[PDB]
Structure 1
Amino acid sequence: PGLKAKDLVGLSQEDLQRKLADLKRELLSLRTMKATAGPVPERIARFRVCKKDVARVLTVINQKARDEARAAFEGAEHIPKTFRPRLTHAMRCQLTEKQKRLLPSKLMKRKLQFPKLKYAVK
């Protein structure tokens, strides 16, 4: 097993960016060794661990940048599309329940004048 996300989440972006370059340079060496292995290698277990390791560091960097940007554009009118609530295409274009339940003033007053009574029949 390789890097754990918990150790990476603590690291600052600058340390995380060095961590990625080192794993990327290591990956070139691991791939070079496989190219020059000739007859057969030793399963190169390090190769998979450092390909998943590059993924974890990049994943943490994205969360570090995504959260930062979500905070900067918080409550601003017209925030970026990536941070907008997911919904669907139809749900964005559907009317809000308030807008759907909006009534003309004459239809609102009359509905108020006769409220829905609860009654029983013998």
Structure 2
Amino acid sequence: PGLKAKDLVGLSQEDLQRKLADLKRELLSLRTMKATVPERIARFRVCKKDVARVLTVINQKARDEARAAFEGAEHIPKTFRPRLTHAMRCQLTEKQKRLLPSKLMKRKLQFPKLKYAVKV
């Protein structure tokens, strides 16, 4: 059970931050009760995961904000860059690899490829 990430979606940043503060103090209270009942020990589990959900939502909203803030620059923060391996980031582009000198290109546009059949 417990709070749903959809029901935290579309809520203001300060409502979210106060709800996180409440959950933190609640886990302190509950941990104190543990060190000093079925409903209480179920609530402890549900509340750990409620904290996790609030923090998930806060991070997702902030990330979308920042990725709009940097959308059209020349230098993007490395966190928002494409997901690619080291090798792929270092490879040449297909256009760069298919670039041809002028004289070679001219002689390649002269006599292009042709479909033909040969009989017996």
Query: Aligned partners of 2:58, 2:95: CA distance in 1, in Å?
Result: 40
Q: Is the 8 A contact 1:27 1:51 kept in 2?
A: yes
The alpha carbon displacement at 1:110 in A equals 1.3
The alpha carbon displacement at 1:115 in A equals 1.0
> Is 1:97 aligned to residue 94 of structure 2?
yes
Using the aligned pairs only, state the percent identity: 100
Query: Aligned partners of 1:10, 1:76: CA distance in 2, in Å?
Result: 28
Unaligned runs of 5+ in 2: none
The alpha carbon displacement at 1:67 in A equals 0.4
Query: Aligned partners of 2:85, 2:40: CA distance in 1, in Å?
Result: 45
Query: Aligned partners of 1:60, 1:98: CA distance in 2, in Å?
Result: 41
Query: Aligned partners of 1:48, 1:119: CA distance in 2, in Å?
Result: 74
**Which of 74, 99, 119 is matched with 1:77 structurally?**
74
Aligned with 1:120: secondary structure? strand
**Aligned residue pairs, count:** 119
Query: Aligned partners of 1:14, 1:119: CA distance in 2, in Å?
Result: 73
The alpha carbon displacement at 1:12 in A equals 1.1
CA pair 16-42 structure 1, distance change in 2 beyond 3 A: closer
TM-score, normalised by the number of residues in structure 2:
0.93
User: Alpha-carbon deviations, 1:63-121, whole Å to 9, x = none?
Assistant: 11000000010121110000000111111101111111111111211111121112222
Query: Aligned partners of 2:5, 2:49: CA distance in 1, in Å?
Result: 11
**Which of 64, 68, 78 is matched with 1:67 structurally?**
64
TM-score, normalised by the number of residues in structure 1:
0.91
Q: Is the 8 A contact 1:9 1:60 kept in 2?
A: yes
Query: Aligned partners of 1:96, 1:13: CA distance in 2, in Å?
Result: 42
Q: Is the 8 A contact 1:34 1:41 kept in 2?
A: no
Greater shift in the superposed pair: 111-120 or 89-98: 111-120
Q: Is the 8 A contact 1:8 1:16 kept in 2?
A: yes
Q: Is the 8 A contact 1:30 1:47 kept in 2?
A: yes
User: Alpha-carbon deviations, 1:14-42, whole Å to 9, x = none?
Assistant: 11111101000001111111111xxx766
